[PDB]
C-alpha cells in the first residue's frame, strides 16, 4: 500500500489524538457558551488612536488601555444602525461565539461593554494587516508560502466544525497576519451553529459554493469549497471564478469547469479539483474520511500539523513592525467622533450583550 507499517501506525495514532483533543475542546466551549460574560470594561479606560477599518454600521479603532498601556482593536457598533440594517441576531451571535471559542488562530476578545449609543468589542490588536494587502502587493504566494497559510485554515475549520460552527465568509480580506507571521480570524458575523443543514443566502460572490447559489439546503462542506477558492487565489494571485458582474461569476461557479495557471504543480491541481467539486458526494471534507482526506493529500505531505498548531514553524514572511501601536500595515481612514447620547437607544434589543 502507500504506507508501510511504521508510518501507518503513526498516522493512525495521530488521528486518534486529534479526536481526543476535539472532545475536550467541545466540552470547554459548551460551558462558556451557556454562561457568557458581560460588561468587563468601560469607554474611558482607553485612549483612541486611529481608525483601522469601517463597515456600514460601525468601525474598528486602535486604542491604548490607560492602566496597562496595552494596545487593542476596539470594534464600535452603532445600535441604531445595527437595527436599521437588520443585523441584531448577527451582532449578538458574533460576540457569543468570540467569548466562547479558544484556538491559536482565532482572535481573542479581551473586553466587551455597551452604553447609550454603541456596542463595544475589544480584541487583541493584530498589527500585520490583512492577507489581502500583502497578496495584492506581492502578486502571488509561492506554493510553500500558500501551504503554510492553508494548513492553519484546515486546522481552524477542523476545530470550528467539531463545535458545529460553519464559518461562511472565508477570504483574504478576513485573514489578518500577526507579529510572528501566523493567521488570525477576526469576524464571525455570518457564522452559525449548524449540526444538520441551513438555508441562508450569505457570503461573498467569488467564494460562494454552488449549492448556496442554487438555493439548496447546505452544510459545513461550503467551508471546504471556500478553502479551495482561497488556496487557488493565494497561489495564482486571482480567484478561480471572476467576471464584471456577480451573476456571471455564479454561472462559472456552477459550471463544474475550472482552469489553472501553467505554474501550478500537479499535486496542487489535484487537491483543488477535489475541493472545488460541484458534486457533494465527491467533495473532499464531505466524505466518510472527513478532514483526513485533506490532511493526508500529497500536497500537504511536508506539513507537520502539530508543529503548525504549536506555532513552531518559521513563517515565510514577517510583516514590518516598528513597535507597539504601529499601524503602517492598515489603510488610512478619515476620523469621525464617537458621540454618546444622553438617552439610551435600543436597550431592549441588545439586553443580552
Amino acid at each position: 500500500g502507500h504506507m508501510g507499517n511504521a508510518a501507518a501506525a503513526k498516522k493512525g495514532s495521530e488521528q486518534e489524538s486529534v479526536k481526543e483533543f476535539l472532545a475536550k475542546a467541545k466540552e470547554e466551549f459548551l460551558k462558556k457558551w451557556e454562561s457568557p460574560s458581560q460588561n468587563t470594561a468601560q469607554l474611558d479606560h482607553f485612549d483612541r488612536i486611529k481608525t483601522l477599518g469601517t463597515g456600514s454600521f460601525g468601525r474598528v479603532m486602535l486604542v491604548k488601555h490607560k492602566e496597562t498601556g496595552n494596545h487593542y482593536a476596539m470594534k464600535i457598533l452603532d445600535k441604531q444602525k445595527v437595527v436599521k440594517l437588520k443585523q441584531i441576531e448577527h451582532t449578538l451571535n458574533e460576540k457569543r461565539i468570540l467569548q466562547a471559542v479558544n484556538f491559536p488562530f482565532l482572535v481573542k476578545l479581551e473586553f466587551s461593554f455597551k452604553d447609550n449609543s454603541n456596542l463595544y468589542m475589544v480584541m487583541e490588536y493584530v498589527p500585520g494587516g490583512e492577507m489581502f494587502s500583502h497578496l495584492r502587493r506581492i502578486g502571488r504566494f509561492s506554493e510553500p508560502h500558500a501551504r503554510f497559510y492553508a494548513a492553519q485554515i484546515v486546522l481552524t475549520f477542523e476545530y470550528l466544525h467539531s463545535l458545529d460552527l460553519i464559518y461562511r465568509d472565508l477570504k483574504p480580506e478576513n485573514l489578518l497576519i500577526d507579529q510572528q507571521g501566523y493567521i488570525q480570524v477576526t469576524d464571525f458575523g455570518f457564522a452559525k451553529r449548524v449540526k444538520g443543514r441551513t438555508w441562508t443566502l450569505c457570503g461573498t460572490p467569488e467564494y460562494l459554493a454552488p449549492e448556496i447559489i442554487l438555493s439548496k439546503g447546505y452544510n459545513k462542506a461550503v467551508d471546504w469549497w471556500a478553502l479551495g477558492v482561497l488556496i487557488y487565489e493565494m497561489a495564482a494571485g486571482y480567484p478561480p471564478f471572476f467576471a464584471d458582474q456577480p451573476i456571471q461569476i455564479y454561472e462559472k461557479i456552477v459550471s463544474g469547469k475550472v482552469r489553472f495557471p501553467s505554474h501550478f504543480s500537479s499535486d496542487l491541481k489535484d487537491l483543488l479539483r477535489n475541493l472545488l467539486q460541484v458534486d457533494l458526494t465527491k467533495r473532499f471534507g464531505n466524505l466518510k474520511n472527513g478532514v483526513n482526506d485533506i490532511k493526508n493529500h500529497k500536497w500537504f505531505a511536508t506539513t507537520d500539523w502539530i508543529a503548525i498548531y504549536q506555532r513552531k514553524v518559521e513563517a515565510p514572511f514577517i510583516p514590518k513592525f516598528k513597535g507597539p501601536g504601529d499601524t503602517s500595515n492598515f489603510d488610512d481612514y478619515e476620523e469621525e467622533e464617537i458621540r454618546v447620547s444622553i438617552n439610551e437607544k435600543c436597550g431592549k434589543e441588545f439586553t443580552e450583550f
Binding site: 489581502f132 495584492r136 465568509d169 477570504k171 480580506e173 455570518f190 443566502l201 450569505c202 457570503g203 461573498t204 460572490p205 467569488e206 460562494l208 494571485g237 486571482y238 471572476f242 467576471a243 464584471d244 456577480p246 482552469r259 495557471p261
Partner: peptide, 18 residues
C-alpha cells in the same frame, strides 16, 4: 492573459459580502 482578464473585471479591490 488570464491576469489581464482579472484586471478587466474591475473586482481587484476589497470585496463586500452580499
Amino acid at each position: 492573459t488570464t491576469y489581464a482578464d482579472f484586471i478587466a473585471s474591475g473586482r481587484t479591490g476589497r470585496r463586500n459580502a452580499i
